[PDB]
Amino acid sequence: RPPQFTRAQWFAIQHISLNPPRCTIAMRAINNYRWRCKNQNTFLRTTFANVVNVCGNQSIRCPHNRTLNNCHRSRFRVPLLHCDLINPGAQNISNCRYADRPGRRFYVVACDNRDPRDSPRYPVVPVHLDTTI
Numbered sequence: 001r002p003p004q005f006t007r008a009q010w011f012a013i014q015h016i017s018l019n020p021p022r023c024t025i026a027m028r029a030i031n032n033y034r035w036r037c038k039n040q041n042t043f044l045r046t047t048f049a050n051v052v053n054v055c056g057n058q059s060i061r062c063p064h065n066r067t068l069n070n071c072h073r074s075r076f077r078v079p080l081l082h083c084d085l086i087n088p089g090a091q092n093i094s095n096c097r098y099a100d101r102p103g104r105r106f107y108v109v110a111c112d113n114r115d116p117r118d119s120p121r122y123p124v125v126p127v128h129l130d131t132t133i
């Protein structure tokens with residue numbers, strides 16, 4: 001487990017977001033938790049349940065993937081949001097400033113085992129993000 005969640009929940013908390021808030025808020029889930037503001041982020045308007053199914057679609061492979069050789073793409077499209085740091089010179093939350101960018105595309109994810117103390121029902125769960133199309 002990561003310091004405050006499982007890998008699979010932490011992955012969801014960053015990127016899986018069926019009914020989000022606006023970007024100035026949505027970004028806080030890392031930009032107010034990490035030592036600097038990240039410039040760009042992506043937030044898929046889907047359910048974790050679909051993403052657990054996407055870690056049971058046929059196995060493909062991704063750009064930065066050699067330590068598992070396994071990722072997958074979604075079989076039909078979903079809505080999303082993207083966010084954008086409007087002045088790259090902010091490094092902290094007293095000055096970092098953003099705006100919204102909604103969209104509908106497929107997505108690409110990597111995946112690994114369950115957690116000893118959470119939701120055993122599913123042997124393999126998502127855990128990272130590569131791109132959207």
Ligand SMILES: CC(C)O[C@H]1O[C@H](COS(=O)(=O)O)[C@@H](O[C@@H]2O[C@@H](C(=O)O)[C@@H](O[C@H]3O[C@H](COS(=O)(=O)O)[C@@H](O)[C@H](O)[C@H]3NS(=O)(=O)O)[C@H](O)[C@H]2OS(=O)(=O)O)[C@H](O)[C@H]1NS(=O)(=O)O
Pocket residue numbers: 010011014034035037038039040064127128129130
């Ligand atoms: C295992 C753990 C440490 O990894 C998780 O957290 C790190 C940050 O580490 S930290 O929390 O311990 O401090 C996350 O990596 C940071 O986010 C990336 C992201 O893609 O979200 C990086 O983004 C930059 O590069 C992207 C290109 O890579 S690609 O998308 O894979 O092709 C760009 O598209 C993106 O715009 C850009 N953002 S930036 O602000 O301009 O840099 C970023 O490099 C990285 O931070 S850094 O300190 O390493 O530079 C992991 O994503 C995360 N893995 S997770 O647990 O699976 O989610």
